[PDB]
Design a protein around this ligand. Structure first.
Ligand SMILES: Nc1ncnc2c1ncn2[C@@H]1O[C@H](COP(=O)(O)O)[C@@H](OP(=O)(O)O)[C@H]1O
Ligand SMILES: Nc1ncnc2c1ncn2[C@@H]1O[C@H](COP(=O)(O)O)[C@@H](OP(=O)(O)O)[C@H]1O
Lengths: 251, 252
């Protein structure tokens, strides 16, 4: 019997993991997956970069929070975001978190408070010279420090099957044992049309860059706009290091 | 922190237990608690003595099974049930389980087939001669054996807060580490009236003895009826849920 060791001394067997993925596919809406997750998991957080998918989840959690509670939000500040991502964060904190006496948890690369700090520590243009090392220092390390310090056992992610590449192989529930977390992907089965429809119907704030072509937004230096025909994440071009953690299992 | 070891290598922390009890209170219907349990726990069964509360659960599970599935049913035959309890067991099997390709699981005292076998093993009238011996051999042992053999991690029980006495302090979810099971009490917040209303509205088969005054039904020798201003359970004074005292026998 394979068992998974998680933060806060939680243990999950393969049978439990398999059982959840078998039963949860029977749920008709992401709101149902989210409601179940809320009831089922203590130490439950959302991670977001304020991508459109995760904004939908924030709004869904907000509607569900009246009956239940609002799971806290974790955002990794890579120090290389578009300013527009950061202003959206403030907008989101004001709208959804401040009213509930919460602040968004923000984690940064260790010992750095700015892009210049980062370049001082590791050299200029690191994302060009060593994408792996950059990925680890900008996002993987801060996220891992966060899970451990904030005692996170489970997280919502904004990943979907229709985003393609490695994400078409996604399950509703996953285990990242290296980080000591369970991941829930409640909009796994939602298309981008569905995500946008929800954003529009519920007037949730979204990144201004979307009105300029940015259907997917990462770092200012590694993100380009895309036309309505191209892949959702074509302006980003390999799975992001925070989801594929095993390549940084040494550090 | 406190962690509980269940059957099937399943482990529950106190924080998980406390979180479930805190959130499940916010649910509005027993059906929602039931739906959640189905999704959450593998190796989920229902235990019943075919008491009125557990019958509601059976029908509720029946309707939910179309979308989900039907958790199997476990009945401990103590060999000292009222005949009509056994007659009701047949009606329920035929109505709810047969059409779903199931039989009701029936566990009896070890090495015994009937009341006469029991009496030839341990002597006549064991319940009045040694109640600890009786409760163990007739109820606790067979139940324990069933949890182990059927690899049960979690059960629905038909206990409610409104049933009075110690049941006033009941939680939605509790843990029985000695048996290696989690216990879910989905109708915890329902009154007998609510239970009776569902039984009536959905034409669920119930014990005939309930019309003859009885409100709670146990063994034939240890079950009295109740009057007007008396408690629903004030007529059979369990062990099946107080298995903790038999620890020295169960810790194997
Ligand atoms: N900087 C960051 N901070 C926190 N979570 C992040 C993150 N970057 C990515 N993620 C997680 O990974 C998901 C995929 O992001 P991307 O599609 O940009 O690769 C994000 O969904 P959302 O940003 O939609 O909530 C989020 O759940
Ligand atoms: N002989 C038996 N076999 C299986 N479960 C039993 C049992 N006796 C009691 N139980 C469980 O304990 C609950 C309370 O029983 P009681 O009130 O008679 O002590 C029962 O609810 P139901 O019998 O309503 O399903 C049932 O879940």
């Amino acid at each position: 019997m394979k068992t998974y060791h998680l933060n806060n001394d939680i243990i999950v067997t393969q049978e439990q993991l398999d059982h959840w993925n078998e039963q949860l596919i029977k749920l008709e809406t992401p709101q149902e997956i989210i409601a179940w997750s809320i009831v089922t998991f203590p130490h439950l957080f959302q991670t977001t970069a304020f991508g459109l998918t995760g904004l939908v989840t924030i709004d869904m959690l907000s509607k569900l929070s009246e009956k239940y509670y609002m799971p806290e939000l974790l955002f990794i500040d890579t120090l290389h975001h578009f300013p527009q991502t950061l202003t959206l964060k403030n907008e989101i904190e004001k709208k959804y978190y401040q009213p509930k006496n919460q602040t968004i948890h923000v984690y940064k690369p260790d010992g750095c408070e700015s892009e210049a700090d980062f370049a001082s520590k590791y050299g200029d243009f690191l994302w060009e010279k060593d994408d792996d090392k950059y990925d680890y220092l900008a996002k993987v390390e801060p996220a891992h420090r966060a899970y451990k310090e904030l005692h996170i056992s489970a997280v919502f992610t904004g990943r979907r099957k229709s985003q393609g590449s490695a994400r078409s192989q996604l399950s509703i529930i996953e285990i990242d044992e290296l980080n000591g977390i369970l991941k829930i992907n409640p909009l796994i089965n939602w298309t981008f049309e569905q995500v946008k429809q929800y954003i529009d119907a519920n007037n949730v704030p979204y990144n201004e860059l979307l009105d300029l072509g940015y259907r997917s937004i990462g770092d200012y230096h590694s993100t380009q706009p895309v036309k309505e025909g191209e892949d959702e994440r074509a302006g980003r071009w390999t799975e992001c290091g925070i989801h594929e953690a095993s390549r940084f299992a040494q550090f």
